């Protein structure tokens, strides 16, 4: 059978940095045409294994999920760099990862006068462990004064919105980005399409 492999790109909202819209299929049929259905790419290059030979690369997990990032910062999606999205929001595993695809969404997710539905988190505590959720949205205490459900000089909101005025230039755009994993390390395997 087939899988909703990249028809998920035909969706309204890719949540925020919090929820990754994790799909995590196990068995379907999918091939390179499902990747190549959509033309405009920004960061189609991938660090793990070159996409010129992605055919017959059958690995019994996808771990594939997507979100939205500002257009100023795209390069931090790479493994192991400095960046608030990649040190505080979500940091990629640095050993071996499947692929990444980036594209603009100025047409679809940039609304005039701002669209405050989107958001990104901020600094917390120690370094973010790679590939983990931080769905807690409670107010941040910097220290000492335990605070009480307010905002002040110590009570700090862990939330901040993109805004995304479409009048901004190449710096600020909705960039929809997806990441995938291709590892097997086990007994079973997924579909080997070209055969």
């Amino acid at each position: 059978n087939l899988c909703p492999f990249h028809e998920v790109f035909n969706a309204t909202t890719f949540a925020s940095v919090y929820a990754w819209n994790r799909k995590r299929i196990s068995n379907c049929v999918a091939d390179y045409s499902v990747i190549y259905n959509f033309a405009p790419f920004f960061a189609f290059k991938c660090y793990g294994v070159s996409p010129t030979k992605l055919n017959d690369l059958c690995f019994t997990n996808v771990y594939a999920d997507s979100f939205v990032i500002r257009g100023n910062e795209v390069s931090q999606i790479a493994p192991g760099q400095t960046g608030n999205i990649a040190d505080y929001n979500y940091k990629l595993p640095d050993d071996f990862t499947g692929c990444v695809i980036a594209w603009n969404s100025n047409k679809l997710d940039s609304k005039p006068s701002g669209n405050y539905n989107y958001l990104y988190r901020l600094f917390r505590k120690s370094k973010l462990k790679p590939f983990e959720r931080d769905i807690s949205t409670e107010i941040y205490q910097a220290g000492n004064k335990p605070c009480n459900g307010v905002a002040g000089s110590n009570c700090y909101s862990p939330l901040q919105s993109y805004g995304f005025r479409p009048t901004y230039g190449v710096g600020h755009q909705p960039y929809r980005v997806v990441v995938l994993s291709f590892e097997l390390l086990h007994a079973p395997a997924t579909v080997c399409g070209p055969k």
């Epitope: 100025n106 609304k111 006068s113 009048t167």
Partner: antibody, heavy 122, light 105 residues
């Protein structure tokens, strides 16, 4: 930074075709000043129909959304309206407008052309 | 989205024009000046300041669910219709009042 408008003089009271034409002169149809059209029945107030920016993101009025298109171009720094199938529902003058300086959470329409009055159903 | 449709005043006597609507203190306002025979122009934006080319006689005010422009001195030049504009941030559209006409002798 001003604007100038032109259009059709006098046509029959029932057809489909309707044209506008705009030129800036003092500005460019590039960014930060979206282009919008305004309608009003004579003897009645204003009614917004549509605003358009350069990099797609097209939008129109919820009313009469069925047959409305806008064509922009920077070969002549122009933009124009395309309303089809008019049946004398509303004849108007259809001024041009821009948003000007974008702010926090508000927009106002500036600057405007002279406006081109057209007859009933063009 | 309401206002009175017309008003009359003596020349040189200060005049109030009013525009109603629920919770319009939350949102801003921009108002326009229509004399029949030409295009309108902006006279007050953000309820507090006017663009270049407009004297101090126009000073908008916002009081909760009401907005009001004050007309200190009155002549035939400003003898015109005045429109209401409200910008929406929810469905992201313009919206308009139907205007209000002033009348002198």
């Amino acid at each position: 930074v001003q604007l100038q408008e032109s259009g059709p003089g006098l046509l029959k009271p029932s057809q489909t075709l309707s044209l506008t034409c705009s030129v800036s002169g003092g500005s460019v149809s590039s960014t930060t000043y979206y282009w919008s059209w305004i309608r009003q029945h004579p003897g009645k107030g204003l009614e917004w129909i549509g605003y358009i920016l350069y990099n797609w993101n097209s939008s129109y009025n919820p009313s009469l959304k069925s047959r409305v298109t806008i064509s922009i171009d920077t070969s002549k720094n122009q933009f124009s309206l395309r309303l089809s199938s008019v049946t004398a529902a509303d004849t108007a003058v259809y001024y041009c407008a821009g948003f000007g300086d974008y702010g926090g959470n508000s927009f106002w329409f500036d600057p405007w052309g002279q406006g081109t009055l057209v007859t009933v159903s063009s | 989205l309401t206002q009175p449709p017309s008003v009359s005043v003596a020349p040189g006597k200060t005049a109030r024009i009013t525009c109603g609507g629920n919770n319009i203190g939350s949102k801003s306002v921009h108002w326009y000046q229509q004399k029949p025979g030409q295009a309108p122009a902006l006279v007050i934006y953000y309820d507090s300041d006017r663009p270049s080319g407009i004297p101090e006689r126009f000073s908008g005010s916002n009081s909760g669910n009401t907005a009001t422009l004050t007309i200190s001195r009155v002549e035939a030049g400003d003898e015109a219709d005045y429109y209401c504009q409200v910008w929406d941030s929810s469905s992201d559209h313009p919206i308009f009042g139907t205007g209000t006409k002033v009348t002198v002798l």
